[PDB]
Amino acid sequence: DPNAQLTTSLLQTYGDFSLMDTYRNYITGFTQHFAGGWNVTNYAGAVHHEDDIARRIWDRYYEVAIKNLVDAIHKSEDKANLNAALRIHRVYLLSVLADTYGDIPASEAGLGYISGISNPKYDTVEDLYGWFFTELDACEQQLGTGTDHISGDVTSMGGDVAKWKKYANSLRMRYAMRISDVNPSKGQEEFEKAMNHADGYIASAADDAYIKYADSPYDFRTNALGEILYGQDPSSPTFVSSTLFYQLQNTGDPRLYRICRHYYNIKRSQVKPDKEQNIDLTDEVLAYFQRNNIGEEPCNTGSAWYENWMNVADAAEFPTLAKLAEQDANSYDNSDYRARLMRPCLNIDFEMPSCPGILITSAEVDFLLAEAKTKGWNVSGDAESHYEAGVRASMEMLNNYYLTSNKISEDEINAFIANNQLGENPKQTINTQAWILHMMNPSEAWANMRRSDYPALLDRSRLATFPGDGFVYDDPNMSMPTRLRYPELEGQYNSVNYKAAIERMGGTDDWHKKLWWDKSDVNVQGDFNPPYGKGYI
Ligand SMILES: [Mg+2]
């Protein structure tokens, strides 16, 4: 039943816990949104490849979503609306697969490959992006030529063909920007084609495209990215990196302590994050810093929370934990949980099972329009207006989709924008602000970081490594990987096509090899001397 297969494929995007290891261990580490958990320190922090972690995106999307999409596409030629929606989500997941690994099966990933009886070649990144524009144009026009109801839709589009059209056009704008370095003229042409389309694009948050997940306890119904970020036990929360912390603090970003909180979480629930026992001591922690003329030490990329050891405050320092330590010291005076309380952690609001699965937002389109303007493309309105719109929408998406309290006021948004105008390097400003936007969309975060080379990351090569703590540094090139390696079993079961793709790369499956649309290395910060804690060597 094709509509059901649309549902499974949509939900798998963020709903499949079995590929979230790749996002917590590698991608969100590579983007330097998160740092300090043992896993991201072991993998992304050590620049340490391991097949079983790197393969999961490939293996799980091909085994489930792509299989179901292709079968449903072939079973839906009489249901043009559903057919177009199936095909748009295939383009979507193929763009993620290609942006992650490089050349990938696509044009030959068909019914035979589904049945496990045929071996698909790896389409080149350049050929795939060419096909993205063509296929999205075709689907966009096909939408609404059927009378069938897209009942398997679980996105915010809610089966509305007009909303799927704007989604397809917005993805065209995303891909057109992606190729704007390697093929400037095609990027310009494809962008303005979509931007000027009669059916429009995602112009306000009312038209945001996202998958809707269920508010049920921790089969793709719940957002598994939040699940793995919440950790599978209270000793493994997701710690916010110093890169993100310092981007927020140093720009006066009201998002600083919406994204960052301090938790003592020993009795927290494991079926659904609870305010009761994810004890939010943020204000009391900050009051403690201020009393002692000290401050935050957000974990550096490459380091774990127990490295670059920060002094641990006694329970007495925090009145809420103090009175609970005095009631029950085994629970609330545990020194390990006090230690992790010291570091900024991701708000559990971002870790709820019902968190959305972002596909593309009006805030991103705003930033695309801003950069399109700074490139001279024929866009209406100045770069600053689009830029400001995108900052305001990124702000507002947290109010609308995530925050359960402490919403960001219109005063704060207006204040922040005034202090962070475009400046002398708009491309850097635009893409740094998009990178915050993309926190919970790690694949777009990593792709757009790679293409735009902003934000300037912390130079991993000048941050500490901790081999004495069991981590393995088996790669001399410690700069951020620009892709993931192919699943190693492809070398056996798709051996000839695997060899070919590797040969096109230069003869080895090299995760320091830049993809076709990635023309330069991501920028890095020249200096990192934080007021508290450790910086560059
Ligand atoms: Mg690059």
**Residues making up the chain, counted from first to last:** 537
Q: How many Å lie between the centroid of ligand 1 and the Cα of residue 281?
A: 39
- HEC string for 296-318: CCCECCCCCCCCCCCCCCCHHHC
How far is the C-alpha of 265 from the C-alpha of 471, rounded, in Å?
A: 26
Q: What angle do CA 65, 38, 301 make, to 5 degrees?
A: 90
What tokens appear for 447 in the block?
Answer: 């792709």
Q: How many Å lie between the centroid of ligand 1 and the Cα of residue 18?
A: 28
Q: How many Å lie between the centroid of ligand 1 and the Cα of residue 46?
A: 21
How far is the C-alpha of 196 from the C-alpha of 136, rounded, in Å?
A: 15
Q: How many Å lie between the centroid of ligand 1 and the Cα of residue 445?
A: 12
Q: How many Å lie between the centroid of ligand 1 and the Cα of residue 507?
A: 21
Amino acid at the residue 415: A
Query: Is 453 annotated to bind ligand?
Result: yes
- List, in order, residues 6 or more apart from 524 with CB less than 8 Å away: 456, 457, 458, 459, 479
Q: What is the DSSP letter of 376?
A: T
Q: H or E segment at 357? A: strand 357-360
Q: How many Å lie between the centroid of ligand 1 and the Cα of residue 254?
A: 29
Q: How many Å lie between the centroid of ligand 1 and the Cα of residue 155?
A: 31
SS3 502: helix
What tokens appear for 227 in the block?
Answer: 């699940």
Q: How many Å lie between the centroid of ligand 1 and the Cα of residue 292?
A: 42
Q: Burial, 404: exposed, middle or buried (Cβ in 10 Å; 0-12, 13-18, 19+)?
A: exposed
**What's the distance, CA 374 to chain centroid?**
25
Q: How many Å lie between the centroid of ligand 1 and the Cα of residue 515?
A: 9
Q: What burial letters (b/e) apply to 202-231, b meaning 16+ CB within 10 Å?
A: beebebbbbbbbeeeebebebbbbbbbbbb
Question: Are the CB atoms for 365 and 438 separated by under 8 Å?
Answer: no
Q: How many Å lie between the centroid of ligand 1 and the Cα of residue 296?
A: 31
What tokens appear for 500 in the block?
Answer: 């070919």
Question: Are the CB atoms for 431 and 452 separated by under 8 Å?
Answer: yes
Question: Are the CB atoms for 102 and 22 separated by under 8 Å?
Answer: no
Resolution in A: 2.0
Query: Is 151 annotated to bind ligand?
Result: no
Query: Is 253 annotated to bind ligand?
Result: no
**Structure determined via:** X-ray
Q: For strands 345-346 and 357-360, give the pairing.
A: unpaired
Q: How many Å lie between the centroid of ligand 1 and the Cα of residue 146?
A: 41
Q: Burial, 39: exposed, middle or buried (Cβ in 10 Å; 0-12, 13-18, 19+)?
A: buried
Question: Are the CB atoms for 297 and 531 separated by under 8 Å?
Answer: no
Task: Give the residues after which the backbone of the chain is interrupted, taking a C-to-next-N distance over 2.5 angstroms as a break.
Answer: 218
Q: How many Å lie between the centroid of ligand 1 and the Cα of residue 523?
A: 8
How far is the C-alpha of 177 from the C-alpha of 372, rounded, in Å?
A: 8
Query: Is 160 annotated to bind ligand?
Result: no
Peptide bond preceding 455 in cis form (omega within 30 of 0)? yes
Q: What is the DSSP letter of 407?
A: P
What tokens appear for 232 in the block?
Answer: 């599978």
Amino acid at the residue 134: T
- Report DSSP letters for 94-110, one per residue: HHHHHHHHSSB--TT-S
**What's the distance, CA 189 to chain centroid?**
27
The residue among 350, 374, 505 whose CA lies nearest residue 439 is: 350
Question: Are the CB atoms for 36 and 241 separated by under 8 Å?
Answer: yes
Q: How many Å lie between the centroid of ligand 1 and the Cα of residue 70?
A: 32
Q: Which domains does the chain have, with CATH numbers?
A: 1-537 (1.25.40.390)
How far is the C-alpha of 181 from the C-alpha of 427, rounded, in Å?
A: 13
CB neighbourhood size of 421 (10 A): 11
Amino acid at the residue 227: E
Question: Are the CB atoms for 254 and 408 separated by under 8 Å?
Answer: yes
Q: How many Å lie between the centroid of ligand 1 and the Cα of residue 479?
A: 12
Q: How many Å lie between the centroid of ligand 1 and the Cα of residue 519?
A: 5
SS3 232: coil
Q: How many Å lie between the centroid of ligand 1 and the Cα of residue 153?
A: 35
Q: How many Å lie between the centroid of ligand 1 and the Cα of residue 324?
A: 49
Q: How many Å lie between the centroid of ligand 1 and the Cα of residue 450?
A: 4
Amino acid at the residue 49: H
Q: How many Å lie between the centroid of ligand 1 and the Cα of residue 484?
A: 15
